[PDB]
Design a protein around this ligand. Sequence first.
Ligand SMILES: [Fe+3]
Ligand SMILES: [Fe+3]
Ligand SMILES: [Fe+3]
Ligand SMILES: [Fe+3]
Ligand SMILES: [Fe+3]
Lengths: 178, 178, 178, 178
Amino acid sequence: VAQGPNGRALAESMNPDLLSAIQQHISIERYASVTFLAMSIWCAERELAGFYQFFDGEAKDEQSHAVHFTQYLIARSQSNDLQTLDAPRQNWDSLASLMATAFQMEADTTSSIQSVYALAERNSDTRTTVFLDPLIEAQIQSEDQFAYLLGRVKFANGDPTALLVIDNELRAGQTQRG
Amino acid sequence: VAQGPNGRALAESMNPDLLSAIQQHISIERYASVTFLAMSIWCAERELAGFYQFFDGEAKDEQSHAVHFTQYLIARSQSNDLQTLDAPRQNWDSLASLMATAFQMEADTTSSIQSVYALAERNSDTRTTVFLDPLIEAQIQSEDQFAYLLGRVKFANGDPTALLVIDNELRAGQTQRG
Amino acid sequence: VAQGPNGRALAESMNPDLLSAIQQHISIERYASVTFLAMSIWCAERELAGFYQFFDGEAKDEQSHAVHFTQYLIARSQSNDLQTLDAPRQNWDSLASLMATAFQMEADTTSSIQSVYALAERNSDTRTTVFLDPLIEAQIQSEDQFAYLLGRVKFANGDPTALLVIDNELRAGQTQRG
Amino acid sequence: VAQGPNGRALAESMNPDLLSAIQQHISIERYASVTFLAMSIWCAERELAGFYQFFDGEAKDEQSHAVHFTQYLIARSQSNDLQTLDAPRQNWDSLASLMATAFQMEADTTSSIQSVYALAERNSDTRTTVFLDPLIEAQIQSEDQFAYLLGRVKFANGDPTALLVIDNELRAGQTQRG
Ligand SMILES: [Fe+3]
Ligand SMILES: [Fe+3]
Ligand SMILES: [Fe+3]
Ligand SMILES: [Fe+3]
Ligand SMILES: [Fe+3]
């Protein structure tokens, strides 16, 4: 039995480019998490308590996604490499602008998973493509959800009354088309 | 015992014009269903999640009405003839315009039942008039309901804040005067 | 943030050939639904109440599959295009012949999903291949189920006594190998 | 306040032809009842226990329908006139022949209600047409049910094995398409 780079028994070697891409994607998930924390704070500073609670939970969810990836590397007997985390964006001129950033970031997280997916396919690493399939499925749902939140906020057209109504929706947990 | 056109035992022959009118009305109900599906989609595309859920259920209800009519033809030992279904309308400039189409379509469905009703009366087919009576009763309630939804949306006068409030009403199942 | 063709925020553009293929497959699912309705009616006309109830539920299931696809296009910020629906086949010389059509139609629905799948792979649209994976899984089960129903009906060799026994199985919900 | 022919206070006089037609229809319902009793006996004599139990209940149901009509005449302050009841048919060459008679008799009971209905319409007696509407509705269901039972028995093509299976269906209460 061979030993993997992290010292565990090795079921199948992983190409170093694919390992590096996964380690990078983990940073992408951790960065999404701290970004959602920053967004939570921005909403709290403006008394948008529903949006604050929503993003507080999103930050914890994204961190869970990052950890899920670290567990996969452990299972593949590959080394993790937790990287320096950049500071998040912390300033927006409007809630609509913030939600645009939030949606774009979810789409960018999917684009990163897609890049890892294509590299695994190039390497014929079907453990990795199988591992990623449900994560892409969850990204489709998150993209649908953040498109809904963004579109609803833009529908409000900057009217505080409408934004308070949506804020109360989010506080109640009404965060998707359903 | 005589055999009906669909092969079952025949309790009472039906005039071919009345059969044809019922088969046509079934198409009217199926078309209302796919129209409500189209309307569900239009609302979903604009993040009006309550209206989307409302029309999603309406589409399924109208299909049930259509099937109910196919069961009546079976019970009368008459042949069904499921027809080509036209594509629904799929584009509206506003929610108020969509709700106008929805109300007019319900009224038109009643007008079709009324035409079948008058033909049955001309033919003295009291099985059919009895069969239709509760369906007209349900149409009165649906006409009242869609007049309420249309009038409430027009009351909002195109203000997104008001439309979000009504959207949340529909998501909660508050869809009638009550 | 870019806007998709249906107006929502766009996570990833879709190739117009792939969009067109999905819209077409939705028609395939809607056509399977109305075909199962027609089959439900044919069985009801011959007092095969178990087969009638089975196909009545199948028709509703296929419609749900069609709607599931419309939701995916919404999630991808792509336009839906509900198409003209052709009239279903409505006449068969025997239950065995009807079940042959039913099985072939399920296989043809899978073939259509497979064509969409191959186009998504050509376009490297892994959101779509992931979205389709569980639908292919369900098609494998439906193909197994309709092969079972068809084979059991052919085993009966046209004997009404055997067909009544199978009819009662279906009424009881015994519709698979289990 | 005027007194009706049965001595009670009279809300609205009834035309003597319509009274006579209702009294006659009551005889039609009582005759259907004793006919179902005869059919119950015929099935019992041939060990068709399910059909025997089914017709035993049908006989009691038809008697209830007859009584329901006597209550309407009481409510209209009209006299009842319970008539001589003819002996039922009691001999059939086959179960299929018996079921044909049973279906024809249900259709004939509806035809009788229809004749009363047309006379009430001629007399503008809308109390009577309203009173009859749910009874026609129930006749549609009974016609559908007896067409199902007749068609299923004819499907058996005189095979005792199939007839035993249907007999067990009826004993279990599986008496309609459902
Ligand atoms: Fe994530
Ligand atoms: Fe999968
Ligand atoms: Fe309807
Ligand atoms: Fe399907
Ligand atoms: Fe009766």
